[PDB]
Design a protein around this nucleic acid. Structure first.
Ligand SMILES: [K+]
Ligand SMILES: [K+]
Ligand SMILES: [K+]
Ligand SMILES: [Mg+2]
Ligand SMILES: [Mg+2]
Ligand SMILES: [Mg+2]
Ligand SMILES: [Mg+2]
Ligand SMILES: [Mg+2]
Ligand SMILES: [Mg+2]
Ligand SMILES: [Mg+2]
Ligand SMILES: [Mg+2]
Ligand SMILES: [Mg+2]
Ligand SMILES: [Mg+2]
Ligand SMILES: [Mg+2]
Ligand SMILES: [Mg+2]
Ligand SMILES: [Mg+2]
Ligand SMILES: [Mg+2]
Ligand SMILES: [Mg+2]
Ligand SMILES: [Mg+2]
Ligand SMILES: [Mg+2]
Ligand SMILES: [Mg+2]
Ligand SMILES: [Mg+2]
Ligand SMILES: [Mg+2]
Ligand SMILES: [Mg+2]
Ligand SMILES: [Mg+2]
Ligand SMILES: [Mg+2]
Ligand SMILES: [Mg+2]
Ligand SMILES: [Mg+2]
Ligand SMILES: [Mg+2]
Ligand SMILES: [Mg+2]
Ligand SMILES: [Mg+2]
Ligand SMILES: [Mg+2]
Ligand SMILES: [Mg+2]
Ligand SMILES: [Mg+2]
Ligand SMILES: [Mg+2]
Ligand SMILES: [Zn+2]
Lengths: 60, 80, 155, 98, 24, 127, 206
RNA sequence: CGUCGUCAGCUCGUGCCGUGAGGUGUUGGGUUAAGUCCCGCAACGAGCGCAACCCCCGCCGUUAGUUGCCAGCGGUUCGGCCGGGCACUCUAACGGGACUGCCCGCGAAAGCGGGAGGAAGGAGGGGACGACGUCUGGUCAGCAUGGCCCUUACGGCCUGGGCGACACACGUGCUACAAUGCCCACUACAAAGCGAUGCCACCCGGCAACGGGGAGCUAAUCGCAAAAAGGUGGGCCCAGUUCGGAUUGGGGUCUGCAACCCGACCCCAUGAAGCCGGAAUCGCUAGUAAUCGCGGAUCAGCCAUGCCGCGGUGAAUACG
């Protein structure tokens, strides 16, 4: 998250390739889960707050 | 075991700069940043200076090398 | 095993001779949990013994085992700087474990290309009183007593 | 022949939408085929607990999507009413392919 | 073994198909 | 007319239907020996019958699904053992001591994190 | 660093979620990014009302929502002049057109999120930490509660060496998965830096 | 977040002892996985920890049938295909169930040793969960944050390099050195998962990668899908060899604006080292180890042999 490289929202990559997920909450670009748009860190933070519906703590 | 498919690739920067430069004939030097582009027939005889990330190496193109990318003549790293 | 005394687990009797001692030998033969392949190998062996011998393979198996059991062995024990090879009796349980283990090891040292032949021929040379297995048993017992001087370190 | 599909994340939120559709129809339609379970589709998220290194910690999270079926035969007009605006669950999504 | 590209078990391991392991 | 048990093992479900007869055993529309083709273990699956002198006084239609053949073999081992009791509840007085009634609970232990295989831990050096 | 968030740990039982809206692998990430935008504003302003919780329900463009505060009025406004601007601020954010109810927090001293916010403010005004903590635990313990605890981070009192002040009463069994313990975390900027404040209130077991 | 650790343990209130730090409680006998419980005690109780409350697996029962059956019967394109039925198996909600309760033995008690019922005993098996605190431990490059510093550049945009360098050294792994093996056929038996700008049945072309074309699926309906190890048969005969597939030459298919540096994948050649590994050293107590394959996240593609999970087959040994 260098608020300038958060130009991912650009949508004008010239070539669809250069497009890269990047976290919506931290800007974290290295563990962004498609399904949540979040990074592994925040995905864990919010899940603890119960702010991610359905998402519980698995155990078996 | 090389490959690319049906549709030999060559950046059109130098292309329309060479096939066009063939109108008057040949010329001294060129300067490209397209290691990407394949060396095609209409280049033989030319002297294309290729960039390696720091320099613009002068590469004399010959018949025997038609097919190889330009990058293959502009070595990136420097060892001993 | 610092608490209990890990009791010996019982094995399911043989699907043929209905012998636990046989399943055991089969387990030692077995590698990578391929208990089927293990089973076949042992059986073709009982068969090869039926061939070259007019005696029930089960009886040969036993006899063999018996001859490879070490009734004495040396165990290392550090006392006063150096380590001393202390000879001492060998529990029944361990004799069995040792006999079977050696049979398979000795058998796989053999020259015959086919696994079944090896166990078969080793099993025979065993009940005969010879074979690489029985040697180990003997090289061990020879080791014991050869150090009877330290037998007082009972352990 | 009314195909009813119930999905969700809570297994009470759905059982509270298979009850507001099981009796409020046994007074206008077929004897109805009771709510049918239908296997769930679990989605696991395994994350490395801490911000930096420590790749051997990890915690396990998951989204369990429960399901239900129902399926009431005989629309009967009168059934299509007792089940027109008489539900409650907010964490549910309903489907009808009758 | 699992490392032999042009073999049966070789293709499986490498999760591919080809002459040495066709899709039936 | 017909008796039936079940039996399950390591995730293998067995449907056992015992009906008086010769001694034929159908496993998924296949001869016992047809399904368990060359599996030294198989023999076991019918041990319960032999445990009470049945087999040659019964016949069995068997269903199966889930797992592997040896696991299925254990399930079948229970079905035949259960039905064999529904037939005559006085048969427990013998199958109990052989534990044929027990459903082996041993199952593939879960794969833990930071550990190659549930228990096998990673090897480390220069400690 | 040990111990899981007591809420994320108790979602199964004694503690429901803060967004009961279902979704599919194509929109979930959106409806999620939305809730956050919501809580983003709600908190950016309603701070003064003292917002403990903020649920968000859905069914289809009819985004329920709610906001449990200690001082409703602050939300409402003169007759309802504030609850108006904001109510339009939601649909201007997301052209979803949604409700915006308001629950009152019976006791703001049994809601960990507030108790935390409480102490957190005092810290910025420069109140003696240990006091605040001692007190806070009281407010909570006096107005009911079978137990309570409060934790402040470090640089307590502008000190260079970060410490960690304690204080707690009654029961606070975190290992017991049934305690029903409200947890609240409050930051606390300062001329010299951040100080973290956690709050735990144990109320009722079974 | 890791770590000492699921190791027990760390404390408090009042009382009592001591000028005091501080003791007593928490020590002591018995017992437990446990500061677990019992008995005894100037101590009586309590808090955080242990355990229990939550999840998964094991047995049984309700409620429920576009998944199951021909168990039962009747139609058969002999395909659960059609009729038809929820029994069974499943699917998934809710319950039951185990308490040392029962019996004999020892004991002051707790509890220990067996025995009977029982799917299951005496924590059934596996998770989630990790006290007061320590390491002044990790992380300002996930985020947040005080101070400091640069603010035509310590900001910003591109194109191309680089993170992939190679005398050399170590860690973690992969594939092997083969006959309990390697091939080629032919045949079985899984479980959890994933699938619109997608899984991709099936058909045609191509040795093949893959390309044309298209059925069905918003999936217990369709698809990935073959599971592999096994089993039957056949080949190889012990050889650096039908072991082993590293290198390297050639020809291609794909993804992508683009594969030189620097992508997987297919086909033909090539066919290295390695014949089981010095001193050292690692894991694991049972469905564990060993072994076999399958799916996922990230992701266009991929350098996944990593990682997180799933099921098949299934040991040895523990005196002490
Ligand atoms: K348990
Ligand atoms: K520190
Ligand atoms: K292998
Ligand atoms: Mg930033
Ligand atoms: Mg990318
Ligand atoms: Mg993403
Ligand atoms: Mg080969
Ligand atoms: Mg067998
Ligand atoms: Mg396994
Ligand atoms: Mg413990
Ligand atoms: Mg005191
Ligand atoms: Mg005094
Ligand atoms: Mg003391
Ligand atoms: Mg004291
Ligand atoms: Mg003490
Ligand atoms: Mg003390
Ligand atoms: Mg003491
Ligand atoms: Mg003790
Ligand atoms: Mg205690
Ligand atoms: Mg005491
Ligand atoms: Mg039942
Ligand atoms: Mg616990
Ligand atoms: Mg350090
Ligand atoms: Mg430091
Ligand atoms: Mg690197
Ligand atoms: Mg290595
Ligand atoms: Mg073809
Ligand atoms: Mg060599
Ligand atoms: Mg070769
Ligand atoms: Mg490349
Ligand atoms: Mg050799
Ligand atoms: Mg995987
Ligand atoms: Mg991928
Ligand atoms: Mg590479
Ligand atoms: Mg890979
Ligand atoms: Zn984040």
């Amino acid at each position: 998250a260098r608020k300038a490289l958060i130009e991912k929202a650009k949508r004008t990559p010239k070539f669809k390739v250069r497009a890269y997920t990047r976290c919506v909450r931290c800007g974290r670009a290295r563990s962004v889960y498609r399904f949540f748009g979040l990074c592994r860190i925040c995905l864990r933070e919010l899940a603890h707050k119960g702010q991610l519906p359905g998402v519980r703590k698995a155990s078996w | 075991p090389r490959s690319l498919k049906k549709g030999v690739f060559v950046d059109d920067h130098l292309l329309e700069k060479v096939l066009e430069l063939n109108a008057k004939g040949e010329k001294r030097l060129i300067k490209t940043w397209s290691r990407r582009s394949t060396i095609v027939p209409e280049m033989v005889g030319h002297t294309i200076a290729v960039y390696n990330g720091k320099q613009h190496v002068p590469v004399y193109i010959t018949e025997n090398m038609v097919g190889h990318k330009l990058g293959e003549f502009a070595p990136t790293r420097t060892y001993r | 095993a610092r608490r209990r005394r890990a009791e010996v687990r019982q094995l399911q009797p043989d699907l043929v001779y209905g012998d636990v001692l046989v399943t055991a030998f089969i387990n030692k033969i077995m590698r990578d949990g391929k208990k089927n392949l293990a089973a076949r190998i042992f059986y073709d062996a009982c068969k090869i013994i039926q061939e070259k011998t007019g005696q029930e393979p089960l009886k040969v198996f036993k006899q063999a085992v018996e001859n490879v059991k070490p009734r004495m062995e040396v165990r290392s024990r550090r006392v006063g700087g150096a380590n001393y090879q202390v000879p001492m009796e060998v529990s029944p349980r361990r004799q069995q474990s040792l006999a079977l283990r050696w049979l398979v090891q000795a058998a796989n040292q053999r020259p015959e290309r086919r696994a079944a032949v090896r166990i078969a021929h080793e099993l025979m040379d065993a009940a005969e009183g010879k074979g690489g297995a029985v040697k180990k048993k003997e090289d061990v017992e020879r080791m014991a007593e050869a150090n009877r001087a330290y037998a007082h370190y009972r352990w | 022949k009314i195909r009813i599909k119930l999905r969700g994340f809570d297994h009470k939120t759905l059982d509270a939408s298979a009850q507001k559709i099981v009796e409020a129809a046994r007074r206008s339609g077929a004897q109805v085929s009771g709510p049918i379970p239908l296997p769930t589709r679990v989605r696991r998220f395994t994350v490395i607990r801490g911000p930096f290194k420590h790749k051997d910690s990890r915690e396990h999270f998951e989204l369990r999507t429960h399901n239900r079926l129902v399926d009431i035969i005989n629309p009967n007009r009168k059934t299509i009413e007792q089940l027109m605006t008489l539900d409650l669950p907010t964490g549910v999504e309903i489907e009808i392919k009758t | 073994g699992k490392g032999d590209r042009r073999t049966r078990r070789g293709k499986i391991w490498r999760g591919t198909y080809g002459k040495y392991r066709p899709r039936k | 007319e017909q008796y039936y048990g079940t039996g399950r093992r390591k995730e293998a479900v067995a449907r056992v239907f015992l009906r008086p007869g010769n001694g034929k055993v159908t496993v998924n529309g296949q001869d016992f020996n047809e399904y368990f083709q060359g599996l030294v273990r198989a023999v076991a699956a019918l041990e319960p019958l032999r445990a009470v002198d049945a087999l040659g006084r019964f016949d069995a239609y068997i269903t199966v699904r889930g797992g592997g053949k040896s696991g299925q073999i254990d399930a079948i081992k229970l079905g035949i053992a259960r039905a064999l009791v529904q037939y005559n509840p006085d048969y427990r007085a013998k199958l109990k001591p052989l534990g044929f009634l027990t459903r082996d609970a041993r199952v593939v232990e879960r794969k833990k994190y930071g550990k190659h295989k549930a228990r096998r831990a990673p090897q480390y050096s220069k400690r | 660093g040990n111990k899981i968030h007591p809420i994320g740990f108790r979602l199964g039982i004694t503690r429901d979620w803060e967004s009961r809206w279902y979704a599919g692998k194509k929109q979930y990430r959106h409806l999620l990014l939305e809730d956050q935008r919501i809580r983003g504003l709600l908190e950016k302003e309603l701070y003064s009302a003292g917002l403990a919780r903020v649920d968000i329900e859905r069914a289809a463009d009819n985004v329920a929502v709610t906001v449990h505060v200690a001082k409703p009025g602050v939300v409402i406004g003169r007759g309802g002049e504030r609850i108006r601007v904001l109510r339009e601020e939601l649909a201007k954010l997301t052209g979803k057109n949604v409700a915006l109810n308001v629950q009152e927090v019976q006791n703001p001293n049994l809601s960990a999120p507030l108790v935390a916010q409480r102490v957190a403010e005092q810290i910025e005004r420069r109140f003696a930490v240990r006091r605040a903590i001692k007190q806070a635990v009281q407010r909570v313990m006096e107005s009911g509660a079978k137990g309570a605890k409060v934790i402040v981070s470090g640089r307590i009192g502008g000190a260079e060496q970060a410490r960690t002040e304690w204080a707690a009463q009654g029961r606070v069994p975190l290992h017991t998965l049934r305690a029903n313990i409200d947890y609240g975390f409050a930051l606390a900027r300062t001329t010299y830096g951040v100080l973290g404040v956690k709050a735990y209130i144990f109320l009722g077991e079974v």
